[PDB]
Amino acid sequence: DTLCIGYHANNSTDTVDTVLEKNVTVTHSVNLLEDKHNGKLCKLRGVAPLHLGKCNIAGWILGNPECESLSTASSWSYIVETSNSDNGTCYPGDFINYEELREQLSSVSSFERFEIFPKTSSWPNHDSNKGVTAACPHAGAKSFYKNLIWLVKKGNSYPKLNQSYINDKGKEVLVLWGIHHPSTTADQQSLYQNADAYVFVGTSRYSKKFKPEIATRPKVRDQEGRMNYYWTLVEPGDKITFEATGNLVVPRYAFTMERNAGSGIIISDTPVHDCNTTCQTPEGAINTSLPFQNIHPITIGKCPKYVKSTKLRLATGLRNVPS
Amino acid sequence: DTLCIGYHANNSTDTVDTVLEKNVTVTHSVNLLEDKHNGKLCKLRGVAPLHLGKCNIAGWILGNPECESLSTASSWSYIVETSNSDNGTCYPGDFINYEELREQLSSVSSFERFEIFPKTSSWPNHDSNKGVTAACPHAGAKSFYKNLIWLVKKGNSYPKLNQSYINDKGKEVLVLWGIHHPSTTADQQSLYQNADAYVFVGTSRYSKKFKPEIATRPKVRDQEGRMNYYWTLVEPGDKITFEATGNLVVPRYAFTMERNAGSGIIISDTPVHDCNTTCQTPEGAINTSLPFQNIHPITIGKCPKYVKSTKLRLATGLRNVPS
Amino acid sequence: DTLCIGYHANNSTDTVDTVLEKNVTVTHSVNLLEDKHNGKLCKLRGVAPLHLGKCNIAGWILGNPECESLSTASSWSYIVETSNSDNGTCYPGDFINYEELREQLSSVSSFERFEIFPKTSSWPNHDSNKGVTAACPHAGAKSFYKNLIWLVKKGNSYPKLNQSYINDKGKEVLVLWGIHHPSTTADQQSLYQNADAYVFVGTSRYSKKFKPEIATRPKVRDQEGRMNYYWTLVEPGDKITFEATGNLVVPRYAFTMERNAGSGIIISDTPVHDCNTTCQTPEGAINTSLPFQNIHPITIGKCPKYVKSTKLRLATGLRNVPS
Amino acid sequence: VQLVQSAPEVKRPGASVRLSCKASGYTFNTYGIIWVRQAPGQGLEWMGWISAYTGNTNYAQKVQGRVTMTTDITTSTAYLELRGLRSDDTAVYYCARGLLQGAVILDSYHYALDFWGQGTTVTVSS
Amino acid sequence: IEGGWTGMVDGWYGYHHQNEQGSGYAADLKSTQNAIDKITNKVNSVIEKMNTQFTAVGKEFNHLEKRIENLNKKVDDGFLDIWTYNAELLVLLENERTLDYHDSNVKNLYEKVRNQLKNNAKEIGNGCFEFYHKCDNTCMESVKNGTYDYPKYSEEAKLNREKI
Amino acid sequence: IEGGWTGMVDGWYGYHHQNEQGSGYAADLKSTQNAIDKITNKVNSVIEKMNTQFTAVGKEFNHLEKRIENLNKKVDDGFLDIWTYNAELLVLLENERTLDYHDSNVKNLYEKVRNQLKNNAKEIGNGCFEFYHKCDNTCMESVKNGTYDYPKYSEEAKLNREKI
Amino acid sequence: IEGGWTGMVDGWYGYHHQNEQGSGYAADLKSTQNAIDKITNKVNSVIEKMNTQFTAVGKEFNHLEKRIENLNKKVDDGFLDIWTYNAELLVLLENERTLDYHDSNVKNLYEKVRNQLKNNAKEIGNGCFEFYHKCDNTCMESVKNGTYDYPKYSEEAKLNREKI
Amino acid sequence: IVLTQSPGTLSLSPGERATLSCRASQSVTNRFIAWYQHKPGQSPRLLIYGASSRATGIPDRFSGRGSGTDFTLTISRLEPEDFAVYYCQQYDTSPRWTFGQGTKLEI
Ligand SMILES: *[C@@H]1O[C@H](CO)[C@@H](O)[C@H](O)[C@H]1NC(C)=O
Ligand SMILES: *[C@@H]1O[C@H](CO)[C@@H](O)[C@H](O)[C@H]1NC(C)=O
Ligand SMILES: *[C@@H]1O[C@H](CO)[C@@H](O)[C@H](O)[C@H]1NC(C)=O
Ligand SMILES: *[C@@H]1O[C@H](CO)[C@@H](O)[C@H](O)[C@H]1NC(C)=O
Ligand SMILES: *[C@@H]1O[C@H](CO)[C@@H](O)[C@H](O)[C@H]1NC(C)=O
Ligand SMILES: *[C@@H]1O[C@H](CO)[C@@H](O)[C@H](O)[C@H]1NC(C)=O
Ligand SMILES: *[C@@H]1O[C@H](CO)[C@@H](O)[C@H](O)[C@H]1NC(C)=O
Ligand SMILES: *[C@@H]1O[C@H](CO)[C@@H](O)[C@H](O)[C@H]1NC(C)=O
Ligand SMILES: *[C@@H]1O[C@H](CO)[C@@H](O)[C@H](O)[C@H]1NC(C)=O
Ligand SMILES: *[C@@H]1O[C@H](CO)[C@@H](O)[C@H](O)[C@H]1NC(C)=O
Ligand SMILES: *[C@@H]1O[C@H](CO)[C@@H](O)[C@H](O)[C@H]1NC(C)=O
Ligand SMILES: *[C@@H]1O[C@H](CO)[C@@H](O)[C@H](O)[C@H]1NC(C)=O
Ligand SMILES: *[C@@H]1O[C@H](CO)[C@@H](O)[C@H](O)[C@H]1NC(C)=O
Ligand SMILES: *[C@@H]1O[C@H](CO)[C@@H](O)[C@H](O)[C@H]1NC(C)=O
Ligand SMILES: *[C@@H]1O[C@H](CO)[C@@H](O)[C@H](O)[C@H]1NC(C)=O
Ligand SMILES: *[C@@H]1O[C@H](CO)[C@@H](O)[C@H](O)[C@H]1NC(C)=O
Ligand SMILES: *[C@@H]1O[C@H](CO)[C@@H](O)[C@H](O)[C@H]1NC(C)=O
């Protein structure tokens, strides 16, 4: 009669590493490193993302003609841009504090596209119809941004603007505008009166005076001039004012928004599909709960810590050594 | 005759966790996590903090009329602000590089209020008695900042201002000033009989020209204009020159200071007491030698690292089981 | 007849620490902490550094007369400066985005100086043979920067400048320029016509207009004025346009570049020698395969992490306990 | 899936009772059986625990000494015994599946109870 | 022992045996479950103690903010190097600790048998016992359980030790 | 050893003395002092090696520096996660290693006693040793000191062992 | 066991040897080679598992970027303290496991021979085994090699046991 | 083990949404909280395990989340079949389970 003291073995081929020995085969192991993903972009925290497709963020927030078909959700957890994201701005220029604006419109708890200054009421003394350019035609028609309008002289007259907005909404309001920089003085006079123009924009916290910078620029698109873009947040109950005698591009639409916990922007060509996850990566949604992954490290959400290892496995069995 | 070997047990109630077992009983344990504090703010590294009580950094360093009751410390380790520290830039405007000023002033080994431009002799061609406003009156009467003088026209004229200072101190001198931005051109003409005006300030490192931006802003504290604030550090042996034709708010006092690279700014309503500590948190001074704390993520001085753990008792004793 | 089991011991004095005991002498140990270095600066990744023994980066890149003795190379991995290297800009002023330029010049794979605007051809209506101040004389000759040329009137005339450049190379080109800020209007008229001068510079991404700031500054290096320095990267195929009516310092030479990798600048007086290293520390190259070093917190290249310790010896042998 | 309980038992106050529950589509040796008492003032009271692997049990702290349990693979039943009862112990005594008991638990499903039984009642009111 | 048992249907540890009533692996279910509970607590401590927070990794910077972009990259690279080194080192150390734990568990069952049999069996040297007693299924079942009435069996063990 | 003792107030480790002359508890002062110095050193190493520096954690930023404020938050969160994860795994590992140390540093003394008393006493297996020879008031000091004297007792002990 | 030897340089572990044909120390090279390979593996894992990327530490900041410079300093100090604390605990803990590993290997060799000699040699307790029977160089080499033909010597060993 | 159901009684019509808050006295890991439904006349059925995971075979109408000492069960629409009683379950490392008292559900 024999009594043998030993341990279980199986046909498992999963191995683990130790400080004293590598490639140790074990009967069971638990993988701490996720190397698989959904391959799809999905909802984060139960809320769908805002997918811009071919449009850039500047394009969407400015209402670029190529973004007319892009429906805006009342809320989103993050923004998705494609690898060919283009048609952001059209009249070329420097979008001021663009990265900060992209950071602010990351995760938004509420987002309503609100009309701040109706086209046919707010500017009875200026022409809101001829403000178009060939930089962004719509079906070749020479169009312009949908959220902003470019005012020009009516009858060789450009009276001073004193339009303001009282922000009677209960949420912060994002107001966008820009400054036009004609190629030469002749274009400043052709487009606007009061060639020695100025623009003033401000709120209780923010105020700044702008001047046109008239000079011939390198050609971009087909117009040797520039359009600088600005934005500001208006606190609930605060008043935002716009004053100008010349090169002011005024908002027509503005966005009333309540911001959520900080999120970010995913650059990816992967299509968007319906799923429910807690962290979304540009390469695809992560479905795991493990502490580490080897998936591309600019993820958004409650994601595990990126590790460059090809495998992380903890042993939970015994040496699988038959004999 | 029987002898036995065993191990110590006692009436201990302190428990520990392990990777293999949870809630084990230990005869004695050393708590590595500090969860207690004095509940009072105290001296850091043997030097008392500057306690502002009610004042903001802008208020104290500019000399807000409601901030005159604070003492002037020769040195401080850190600065304490209350949650009600709204007494700051009483005349609305953009304080330029305000966060940098707060960082620079967070820890000073030697600090003195020095009169840089004597009130009765430095501006014989300008009116230094007016310039009091309703934005921050004192005892119901119009007043202005203690450390700044808002110069206005002597009477139907604003003579050219050109005043330099040579830094004869052995320490760096912090010089503050501001620029006034009237609401309308009538306000500019009333205060400064110069119409278009400019301000120039410079040192051996700093050189900048300012131009008034006249425009109507939203009304804040009954004011329609704005006053921007500027500052610079003059190295010993250098000089600062203030050249202006109007819209310049000139210093009266400047601060001689020897800067450290230590503490930060604590915003807390905790009272100040006398203690010998090395670490200060908004909730109170910490007296501990332990490697970890769960008291507050915002820490000043040579303190343990903040963790989210609620229990890190080290099982320094023996397993305590009855028999 | 008799056997006894034991273990190797010798006369080694290498001593290791444990959590349970300190100063435990062992027969063999391996160091994990590198505490030695070559004491010499060497080539990083097989390509030599650019060594500016006397010149600062502003001095070298601007062509300061004292920099003619520096070597020229098509590539380098890092920039070496010494404790006596303070010859930077000679005409005092604020070099705009200087730190960003220093970060971008730290590693270039194809650096060549190219004459962008031939001195005797591109500006036939301006005086290119003046623009010398003796702030940085060459052998006392009263000279100026060699990479930039300072244009002045041709003799009671300053025709508008509209010089542009098309980048016809496959590499990015760095174009430098500066703007002169005379002390007073008498100097504005002495060097330039068109007292109300402007400077405009732009590319397909960059567009900025500048105006002179005419004011008296503290006297620095015998000058009462200032010269600000600006730069831009022109992408292949892009057009950079310089327009001015005065106060413009124009490039003569421009630098074609291809940024290769992140790198940095070492401030050190250690001599440069021809050794193949994996990183460079200010005190000398560290030739090592260990995970940790205690030589300097700010190294350049792929080498150990800085640890504030004197001993990290990992035991391999047995306790060295002779009878 | 869905454990089997049948034949309600009615006895007398001051006398022992026996309860049973049979496994459904399982191997029996990869889980335990836990009972929950349903009564007008208790709601759900965790009574009993067993593991069909080790034979170990945590009973219940306030009822130790009144309940005995043992497994029997041959007929697949919990085979609960209850003795020294009063009359307040009348309850449904639902059967449920407990811990995995035999593999590392990486899924919170193996702590939560599921697949409850049919709820055969016991009445001791005579 | 020479190696593990590929023919055992369950458990991690056991008492493989052969006697006149047959043979089998007789898995040790109580010590296996104890090991499972402790290893389960270990893996859950490694996984669940990661206090992952909701945060966004990656920031958009302009072409004139290169030092900040390099600082962000420095932070991401430093955290990646710390988490890669600590995660990989933790795995190797924890696996050495886990396999040493399991080997000590087998040693613990062997030691249990040695204390229970009290020289009523001899060691072979590869983790096995050769019984002096003709040890039937009840005998072995009692040994597996941890109960062994040494003084009634010791008379036969003594005679068999005299015989060798 | 079923568990610990509450009678043995002074010292973590020790022995139960009992004979026909008296009884009581006493410490093994050599092993207790060795364990105390090693554990105190372990604690001192855990605390002393923190490189606490005079810092100012937490920076305030303008509303137009949201990316930088988020970078500061990212750094604080990364350091918080690193310190929390490593502190919790460090404490759990040190607690398991310390408790295993204590069990090893009592079992090894039990084995030491076995090595000192190889044939004059029968070990029971629960920490108790049944002596066959008469114990005087110096047997306990001999056990604590070691160098147990076999010739002093010799055949007397086996004379009782031969009874069974 | 109670101290080291300076009489041999061929390996870490070995035996004392005095016999009819001479004396002199020699290592057991299979166990020694296994220990060196495993310790080398540990060392190679500590060094190779450190991840390194080509980057740069240290950034140039202006006088109006003090908060950013202090953020960079905060990052450098955090990473420095994290690496220092983890490196120091790693070294202290690895030195503890390494020294205990070496002691375990010595005990493993001690048991390796003890389980072969059984009752045919006097156990002294200090690591020395004094054989009751005579053993020439061949006997000692067979023991050191790892196989001992116990049935051929037990008669002499038991006869010598009876006289002692 | 202390489990408290705060609202006591929830009386809401179908088509609305409601929550049940279960407070624990001891902070525990999320792995040990489960939510159950008890329709009178039938046996309890598992709704949620692990404080968030969906039970096998249940519609998306039933959800929940929680942490620390405060866990919430969220019921959407509140169909007629939902007007029963809910129980909060807690496990604490050792093989010890408890249930709360629940709340009344009324139209
Ligand atoms: C091992 O063999 C069994 C036989 O049924 C099979 O079910 C199992 O999947 C196999 N595992 C591996 C890893 O081959
Ligand atoms: C472990 O397996 C990998 C993959 O085949 C191999 O590259 C490596 O050399 C192996 N190492 C050892 C020690 O067997
Ligand atoms: C889960 O996914 C489904 C997809 O059918 C969706 O309807 C549901 O709203 C998602 N969950 C949340 C909380 O949004
Ligand atoms: C949109 O972008 C594409 C990119 O090539 C460009 O060709 C097209 O003209 C753009 N259209 C508008 C309206 O901006
Ligand atoms: C996502 O994860 C859950 C468990 O966390 C799993 O049940 C589900 O099947 C996963 N999704 C897919 C598509 O497999
Ligand atoms: C343990 O009991 C003693 C009295 O014997 C008492 O002084 C001590 O405070 C008690 N400690 C605890 C933790 O109960
Ligand atoms: C730990 O166990 C004790 C009883 O030994 C108990 O009183 C205590 O509440 C338990 N602690 C936890 C957190 O479960
Ligand atoms: C410590 O506190 C006392 C309070 O009496 C104070 O006088 C002393 O100055 C403090 N220590 C230092 C170094 O300031
Ligand atoms: C200080 O702040 C309080 C806030 O209630 C405000 O009422 C008061 O006017 C401020 N002081 C001055 C001088 O404006
Ligand atoms: C801090 O605590 C120690 C005891 O650990 C005490 O001696 C010391 O006085 C305390 N310091 C203060 C300032 O209270
Ligand atoms: C150890 O002894 C050898 C013998 O040659 C000698 O070379 C070596 O230097 C000694 N070690 C020390 C630290 O002196
Ligand atoms: C260990 O040796 C070093 C030698 O530099 C000495 O400074 C230290 O105090 C010693 N420590 C102990 C505990 O002997
Ligand atoms: C090593 O140095 C030599 C001499 O300067 C050089 O030719 C060689 O290229 C260097 N190695 C590499 C990899 O560049
Ligand atoms: C270059 O060198 C010296 C040393 O700093 C400096 O003072 C001097 O002004 C410089 N001369 C030039 C650039 O001509
Ligand atoms: C650098 O170290 C390696 C070992 O890691 C060595 O082989 C090489 O020769 C060393 N080179 C120099 C120049 O020290
Ligand atoms: C198993 O051991 C327990 C321990 O008390 C005992 O009660 C039981 O009768 C034993 N059973 C067998 C079959 O040996
Ligand atoms: C010595 O060890 C080897 C190892 O394989 C073995 O084959 C040989 O038989 C041993 N010597 C004797 C005499 O058994």
CB spacing of E38 vs B308 below 8 angstroms:
no
The verdict on the CB of residue B43 being under 6 Å from ligand 8 is yes
Q: How crowded is residue H56: how many other Cβ atoms within 10 Å of its Cβ?
A: 11
List the alpha helices (DSSP H) in chain C: 57-62, 98-104, 185-191
Q: How crowded is residue F43: how many other Cβ atoms within 10 Å of its Cβ?
A: 16
Residues of G in contact with C3 (CB under 8 A): 15-17, 113, 128-129, 131, 140, 143
Distance between CA atoms of B131 and B142, rounded to whole angstroms? 9
Report yes or no on E146 lying in a domain. yes
CA torsion sign for F81, F83, F88, F92 is positive
Which ligand is the nearest neighbour of the Cα of C17?
A: 12
- Give the resolution value in Å: 3.3
Chain length of chain D: 126
Which ligand is the nearest neighbour of the Cα of B48?
A: 8
Distance between CA atoms of H21 and H86, rounded to whole angstroms? 11
Which of G41, G46, G51 minimises the CB distance to A21? Answer: G41
The CATH number given to whatever domain includes residue D88 is 2.60.40.10
The chain G residue lying nearest A308, using CA atoms, is G51
Q: F150: CA distance to ligand 5 center in Å?
A: 70
Residues contacting residue E156 through CB under 8 Å, at least 6 positions apart: E132, E133
Distance between CA atoms of A9 and E14, rounded to whole angstroms? 11
Residue A232 in contact with partner chain B when CB distance is under 8 A: no
CA torsion sign for F154, F157, F163, F164 is negative
Q: Please, which residues bridge with residue A121 across strands?
A: none
Distance between CA atoms of E127 and E110, rounded to whole angstroms? 7
For H97, the 3-state DSSP assignment is strand
CB spacing of F42 vs C21 below 8 angstroms:
no
Domain encompassing residue F26: 14-161
Neighbour-count burial of C138, counting CB atoms closer than 10 A to its CB (0-12 exposed, 13-18 middle, 19+ buried): middle
Distance between CA atoms of F123 and F131, rounded to whole angstroms? 9
CB spacing of G68 vs F68 below 8 angstroms:
yes
As a CATH number, domain B43-267 is 3.90.209.20
Distance between CA atoms of C170 and G23, rounded to whole angstroms? 80
Q: Chain F: nearest CA to E110, how far in angstroms? A: 14
Q: A206: CA distance to ligand 9 center in Å?
A: 21
Class in CATH terms, B1-36+288-323: mainly beta
Q: How crowded is residue F118: how many other Cβ atoms within 10 Å of its Cβ?
A: 11
For B29, the 3-state DSSP assignment is coil
Distance between CA atoms of D8 and D17, rounded to whole angstroms? 11
Distance between CA atoms of D55 and D32, rounded to whole angstroms? 10
H/E segment holding residue G77: helix G66-117
E97-E102-E106-E108 Cα dihedral, nearest 10 degrees: 60
Residues contacting residue B13 through CB under 8 Å, at least 6 positions apart: none
Distance between CA atoms of F35 and F50, rounded to whole angstroms? 24
Could you tell which of H1, H2, H25, H26 is best to mutate to test the pocket of ligand 7, judged by most ligand atoms within 8 Å of the CB? H26
Could you tell which of C44, C276, C287, C290 is best to mutate to test the pocket of ligand 15, judged by most ligand atoms within 8 Å of the CB? C287
Structure tokens given for C264: 């940095």
**Residues C51-82: b if buried by 16+ CB within 10 A, e if exposed:** bbebbbbbbbbbbbbebeebeeeebbbbbbbb
- List the one residue out of D11, D1, D4 whose CA is nearest residue D81: D11
Q: Are C241 and G34 in contact (CB under 8 A)?
A: no
Q: How crowded is residue F79: how many other Cβ atoms within 10 Å of its Cβ?
A: 24
Residues contacting residue F146 through CB under 8 Å, at least 6 positions apart: F112, F116
Side-chain half-sphere CA neighbours of C261 within 13 A:
15
* Residue B209 to residues A77, B162, B254, C216, Cα–Cα distance (Å): 44, 14, 21, 11
What is the residue type of G144?
K
Structure tokens given for C38: 């070559």
Residue B207 in contact with partner chain C when CB distance is under 8 A: yes
Residue C102 — φ and ψ, nearest 5°?
-60, -35
For B15, the 3-state DSSP assignment is strand
A64-A68-A70-A75 Cα dihedral, nearest 10 degrees: 80
Structure tokens given for C185: 């209007």
List the alpha helices (DSSP H) in chain A: 57-62, 98-104, 185-191
Residues contacting residue B21 through CB under 8 Å, at least 6 positions apart: E38, E41, F96
Residues of H in contact with B22 (CB under 8 A): 93
Query: Number of CB pairs < 8 Å for B and G?
Result: 13
Query: Solving technique for this entry?
Result: cryo-EM
Q: C268: CA distance to ligand 14 center in Å?
A: 19
The chain A residue lying nearest D108, using CA atoms, is A289
For C221, the 3-state DSSP assignment is coil
Residues of D in contact with A30 (CB under 8 A): 104, 106
Angle (CA) C238 C240 C244, round 5°: 165
* Residue E39 to residues A314, B12, E106, Cα–Cα distance (Å): 10, 27, 15
Distance between CA atoms of H52 and H72, rounded to whole angstroms? 10
Report yes or no on E36 lying in a domain. yes
Q: What is the CA radius of gyration of chain D?
A: 14
DSSP string, B178-194: EEEE-SSHHHHHHH-TT
Atom 11 of ligand 14 has which residue's CA nearest to it? C136
* Residue A28 to residues A10, A241, E6, E98, F31, Cα–Cα distance (Å): 9, 69, 13, 12, 40
Ligand 10, residue B276: give the atom nearest the CA: 13
Report yes or no on F111 lying in a domain. yes
With left for phi above 0 and alpha for psi between -120 and 50, is residue G138 left, alpha or beta? Answer: alpha
Distance between CA atoms of E9 and D53, rounded to whole angstroms? 13
Assigned architecture for domain C44-266: Alpha-Beta Complex (3.90)
Chain length of chain F: 164
Structure tokens given for C128: 């290119």
Distance between CA atoms of A318 and A16, rounded to whole angstroms? 11
Distance between CA atoms of H12 and F122, rounded to whole angstroms? 76
| DSSP conformation class of C270 | P
Residue limits of CATH 3.90.209.20 in chain A = 44-267
Q: Are E14 and E8 in contact (CB under 8 A)?
A: yes
Distance between CA atoms of A112 and A258, rounded to whole angstroms? 9
Residue G20 — φ and ψ, nearest 5°?
-60, -35
Q: Are F161 and B24 in contact (CB under 8 A)?
A: no
Residue F61 — φ and ψ, nearest 5°?
-135, 160
- List the one residue out of B122, B144, B148 whose CA is nearest residue B135: B144
Could you tell which of B287, B288, B289, B290 is best to mutate to test the pocket of ligand 10, judged by most ligand atoms within 8 Å of the CB? B287
| DSSP conformation class of A69 | T
Distance between CA atoms of C43 and C55, rounded to whole angstroms? 20
Show the ligand 17 pocket: residues with CB < 6 angstroms: G 142, 145-147
Distance between CA atoms of G61 and G70, rounded to whole angstroms? 10
Angle (CA) F3 F9 F12, round 5°: 60
The CATH number given to whatever domain includes residue F134 is 3.90.20.10
Could you tell which of C8, C11, C28 is best to mutate to test the pocket of ligand 11, judged by most ligand atoms within 8 Å of the CB? C11
Q: Are C30 and C300 in contact (CB under 8 A)?
A: no
Beta strands H9-11 and H104-106, pairing class? parallel
- List the one residue out of D112, B95, A197 whose CA is nearest residue H45: D112
Q: Please, which residues bridge with residue D17 across strands?
A: D82
The chain H residue lying nearest E40, using CA atoms, is H93
H/E segment holding residue B99: helix B98-104
Domains and CATH numbers, chain H: 3-106 (2.60.40.10)
Structure tokens given for A34: 């996720």
Q: Please, which residues bridge with residue H64 across strands?
A: H73
What is the residue type of F120?
N
Q: C68: CA distance to ligand 14 center in Å?
A: 13
Distance between CA atoms of E136 and E20, rounded to whole angstroms? 7
Among all chains, which residue has been given the structure tokens 């088509």? H15
DSSP string, H13-72: -TTEEEEEEEEESS---GGGEEEEEE-TTS--EEEEETTTEEPTT--TTEEEEEETTEEE
Structure tokens given for B196: 């278009």
H/E segment holding residue B103: helix B98-104
What is the residue type of B31?
N
Among all chains, which residue has been given the structure tokens 């709120």? A203
C305-306: strand order across its sheet: C33-34, C292-293, C305-306
Domain count for chain F: 1
- At the fourth CATH level, which superfamily is domain A44-267? Haemagglutinin, alpha/beta domain, HA1 chain (3.90.209.20)
Distance between CA atoms of A88 and C207, rounded to whole angstroms? 19
Which of C16, C30, C307 minimises the CB distance to G87? Answer: C307
Report yes or no on D125 lying in a domain. no
Instruction: Give the E-state strand segments of B45-168 in sequence order.
Output: 50-51, 79-81, 108-115, 133-138, 141-143, 148-150, 161-166
Residues contacting residue C179 through CB under 8 Å, at least 6 positions apart: C199, C210, C212, C227, C228, C230, C247, C248, C249
Structure tokens given for D77: 């039943």
Which residues 280-319 of A have a C-beta within 8 angstroms of G?
Answer: 308
- At the fourth CATH level, which superfamily is domain A1-37+286-323? Hemagglutinin Chain A, Domain 2 (2.10.77.10)
Distance between CA atoms of C191 and C187, rounded to whole angstroms? 6
A121-A127-A130-A136 Cα dihedral, nearest 10 degrees: -60
Helix axes G29-48, G66-117, angle to 10 degrees: 170
The verdict on the CB of residue B135 being under 6 Å from ligand 10 is no
Residue A228 — φ and ψ, nearest 5°?
-90, 140
For C144, the 3-state DSSP assignment is coil
Q: Chain B: nearest CA to C215, how far in angstroms? A: 7
Angle (CA) A244 A250 A254, round 5°: 140
Residues contacting residue A125 through CB under 8 Å, at least 6 positions apart: A154, A157, A159
Q: Are B92 and B221 in contact (CB under 8 A)?
A: yes
For C86, the 3-state DSSP assignment is coil
Neighbour-count burial of C292, counting CB atoms closer than 10 A to its CB (0-12 exposed, 13-18 middle, 19+ buried): buried
Distance between CA atoms of B296 and B275, rounded to whole angstroms? 19
Q: Are H33 and H89 in contact (CB under 8 A)?
A: yes
Which residues 67-126 of B have a C-beta within 8 angstroms of F?
Answer: 78, 98-99, 102-103, 106-107
The chain A residue lying nearest C240, using CA atoms, is A218
- List the one residue out of F124, F129, F128, F121 whose CA is nearest residue F158: F121
What is the residue type of A239?
K
For F118, the 3-state DSSP assignment is coil
Residues contacting residue E79 through CB under 8 Å, at least 6 positions apart: A305, F78, F82
Distance between CA atoms of B265 and B263, rounded to whole angstroms? 7
Ligand 3, residue A275: give the atom nearest the CA: 2
Report yes or no on G140 lying in a domain. yes
List the alpha helices (DSSP H) in chain F: 29-48, 66-116, 139-145, 155-161
